[PDB]
Fold this protein.
Amino acid sequence: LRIKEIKELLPPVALLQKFPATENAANTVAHARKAIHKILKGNDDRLLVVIGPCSIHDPVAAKEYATRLLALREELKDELEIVMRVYFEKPRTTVGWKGLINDPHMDNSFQINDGLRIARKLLLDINDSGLPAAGEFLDMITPQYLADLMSWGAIGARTTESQVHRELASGLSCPVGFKNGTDGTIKVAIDAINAAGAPHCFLSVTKWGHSAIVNTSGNGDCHIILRGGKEPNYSAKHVAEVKEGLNKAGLPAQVMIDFSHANSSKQFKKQMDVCADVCQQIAGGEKAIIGVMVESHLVEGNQSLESGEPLAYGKSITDACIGWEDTDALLRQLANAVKARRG
Amino acid sequence: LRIKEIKELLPPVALLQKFPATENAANTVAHARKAIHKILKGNDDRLLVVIGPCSIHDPVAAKEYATRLLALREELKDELEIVMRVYFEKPRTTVGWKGLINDPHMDNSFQINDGLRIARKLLLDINDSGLPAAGEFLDMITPQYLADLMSWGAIGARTTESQVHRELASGLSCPVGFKNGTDGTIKVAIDAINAAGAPHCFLSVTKWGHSAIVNTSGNGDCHIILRGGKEPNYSAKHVAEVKEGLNKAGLPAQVMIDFSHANSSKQFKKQMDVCADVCQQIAGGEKAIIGVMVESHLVEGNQSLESGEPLAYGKSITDACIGWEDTDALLRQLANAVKARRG
Ligand SMILES: [Mn+2]
Ligand SMILES: [Mn+2]
């Protein structure tokens, strides 16, 4: 057998009971989801902005970032719907740290029970403060522990074509963005949107920690996310092709543009260049761009865990992010671009 | 919420108790896994042949097919290690029938409990007759109900890059083949092989139907499956590039070639053309080709569930397959090629 050991896992209900949603938290989620729904439906000209760390590895830095971002969210609420990237799960090209939930202590001790408690506690605090959260839905079992506190979700480039993730999206209570393939393929995301919009029947683990048969209604609040491929795909030229592709597929011609990952060629400072281009498109009247994604942290760059020496505070241990000063500038640029488009 | 209904699911132990593996079925699995391991280690010059229906939709036709295939398995055993495709799970491009387990009655009744009982009983019958089984591991929960009766597994083109599928493979007791991406991307499969070979810690459902924390050892019996992209990738030029790519990644230059799907341009009869070329490669001395995959049924072609017309017996309701006559001829061609390669 290739199973070394099997260990006890607290059921979702244990986490929901220990960390119940507060009225403020529930309101934050309900309002954010509705706001995003209105944008996708075309009943609001504001831009959805999913911004924050590539991954959460420290609740302290996470809450500090959340407090700073909440101020920006309030300041620019007329042009932007700001949602924090609160990513607890990370897909790896091969192997590596999978996130706070899988290995919170970042030492391969895999204390997942601790990870889930730490994650829900933080997610609860952030929502309670009035700031919506976004994250990648990678795992099929973790959703039950945190989905009630998520206002928007993403299906990664490496899983957009996966039927199991499309099934999951079809039953999520929040809007969902599907990233194009790592090679830049757009079709897998368009297909994912259509698939997730239909009802599905599949096996899933309930809040009681038991497997069961579930039937979903389908999720109409799904959209594509352009995150680049071999080459970036954020330009007006690419946006134009994607819009036609969506229409041809019978879908609304709308897109979210990720400024990071392949669109910045893995160079964090380049997110500022992507921003400039996207702002020009938006300011120029491009109504298709309904959202953007940015990897930002308190301090720019990133650091390695394999290094050894203590970790620098508020610095990413996964993908490099832009610092807070550039983050303030970028959010401002976007807000102004939205105003320009609005006229 | 987008969750319409939640229904009770029999736990794996219920199916294991109702349908225990017989001594002969257990032997079939044990011997097949060992034989494939020997081929993957370069200690056997025979060819692994995973052949059978695109999908199983009728136990009666499946068993008739199994008897016919078993006869050839015994007759050609000195050259081929024949394993029947007994696929109960199907990944769709968008939406569609997902296979016998998900909807055994093929009418959207999704009687999965019936599906699991029918599936395991069929696997038990086929294995007890001495014929090993192959299947795609798409779902994260169904493995516990059938894995003990699987001699080889596949991770589909649409899920090879998925971390959750790589995790699953890392803990499977049988050899696993990773298909290249739908766009022909080879790198995702090479990365998958390395990822699956390492130990993983993740959440999964136990045989008791409860979620838990699992630790895997890693699966060293993984290989790539060439199934085409925008263009077929079965020719010597492509095999050469893949052998080089595997070696560059520190892996043995071995490949399984799927004659169907993108390699036949989804035209079932071209599987015979792919066979002719692959046989020439094998007979010519290509040792890297350790296996092939072929979509075959009692009757050639396919049919749709959409018309409402009664289904023809022994004919695929998913991808088109070659019929029995062509199957017998193809298997003999492969056996002759392996004999020639040996000289
Ligand atoms: Mn990232
Ligand atoms: Mn097929």
